Design an enzyme around this catalytic site. Structure first.
Site, short mmCIF file in Angstrom:
data_model
loop_
_atom_site.label_atom_id
_atom_site.label_comp_id
_atom_site.label_asym_id
_atom_site.label_seq_id
_atom_site.Cartn_x
_atom_site.Cartn_y
_atom_site.Cartn_z
N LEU A 125 -39.61 -5.80 36.33
CA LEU A 125 -39.08 -6.28 35.06
C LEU A 125 -39.26 -5.22 33.96
O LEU A 125 -38.37 -5.06 33.13
CB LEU A 125 -39.74 -7.60 34.65
N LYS A 152 -48.57 -8.37 35.28
CA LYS A 152 -48.75 -7.04 34.71
C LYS A 152 -49.80 -6.32 35.55
O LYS A 152 -50.93 -6.80 35.65
CB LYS A 152 -49.16 -7.10 33.22
N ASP A 182 -46.70 -4.62 16.85
CA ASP A 182 -45.60 -3.90 17.48
C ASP A 182 -44.44 -4.83 17.74
O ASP A 182 -43.82 -4.81 18.79
CB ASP A 182 -46.04 -3.17 18.75
#
Ligand code: 1HK
Length: 263
Positions: free
Chosen positions: A13, A31, A113
């Site tokens: 992804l 992750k 961010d």
């Protein structure tokens, strides 16, 4: 139940892999890798506009983070270059983004961010804030901490991060939300960075809204952007006041198309 703990990695992804459970076929994002801080901040989060954290596992030197899978992908891929997207869709995404940011700021976390690459969409196009790798605590025991570290992505960073040694965390996230709103409504970023050396940034401070990207934006959302993209962070609009903005409260978007028959 045997095999309920086994997941097959089926596609990349982002690294981030799409994992499918061998038994239930439940889909999750994993992750595979600062990481202690990212896990600690993630363990504090529980909100419908924040990508859910399910847990973590460490096998040797590799850290595995199990996260909510957002099948709609990045908000970035819904922005047509030089066009943006329909104003009612941008308003709905902006409402969801504000709900997520309110939540984080309420528990004393700053994202640092915010950008369309980090805003994901679930199967019903619900916006979810993702990637807490640069996030930090700015309020603890009801005491605010000023930030000083350079964090973020230049086109989305607030000008005080480039001009001041210390700054308040919340107006920085508000600023980046205003750049996200600009990108959704114009399909382009207004400047490489918010510095007086950048002609586009000086043109904005001189209110030259007859130029792109501003000329492509209707006066009601543009009036909101005039309140967000304010250089002085102490004069910049706060989220409770964004929630009272005229465009923010304008009826635009019809609900999801529900099945119906005639006669
Ligand atoms: C909530 O916290 C995090 C979430 C993510 C990613 C989660 C996630 N969930 N679903 C997807 C992704 C990336 C991605 C990219 C493209 C398409 C789908 C997806 C990374 C670090 C995080 O700290």
């Amino acid at each position: 139940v045997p095999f309920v703990e086994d997941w097959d990695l089926v596609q990349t992804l982002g690294e981030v892999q799409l994992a499918v459970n061998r038994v239930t076929e439940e889909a999750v994002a994993v992750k595979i890798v600062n990481i202690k801080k990212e896990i600690c901040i993630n363990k504090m989060l529980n909100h419908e506009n924040v990508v859910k954290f399910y847990g973590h596992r460490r096998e040797g030197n590799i850290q595995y983070l199990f996260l909510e899978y957002c099948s709609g992908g990045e908000l970035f891929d819904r922005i047509e270059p030089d066009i943006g997207m329909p104003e009612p869709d941008a308003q709905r995404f902006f409402h969801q983004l504000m709900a997520g940011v309110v939540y984080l700021h309420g528990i004393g976390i700053t994202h640092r961010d915010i950008k369309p690459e980090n805003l994901l969409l679930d199967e019903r196009d619900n916006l979810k804030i993702s990637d807490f790798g640069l996030a930090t605590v700015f309020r603890y025991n009801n005491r605010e901490r000023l930030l000083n570290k350079m964090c973020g992505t230049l086109p989305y960073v607030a000008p005080e991060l480039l001009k001041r040694r210390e700054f308040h965390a919340e107006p920085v996230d508000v600023w980046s939300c205003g750049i996200v709103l600009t990108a959704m409504l114009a399909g382009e970023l207004p400047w490489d960075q918010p510095s007086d050396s950048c002609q586009e940034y000086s043109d904005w401070k001189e209110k030259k809204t007859y130029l792109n990207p501003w000329k492509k934006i209707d006066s009601a959302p543009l009036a909101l952007l005039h309140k967000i993209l304010v250089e002085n962070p102490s004069a910049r609009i706060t989220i409770p006041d964004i929630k009272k903005d005229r465009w923010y409260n304008k009826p635009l978007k019809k609900g999801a198309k529900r099945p119906r028959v005639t006669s």
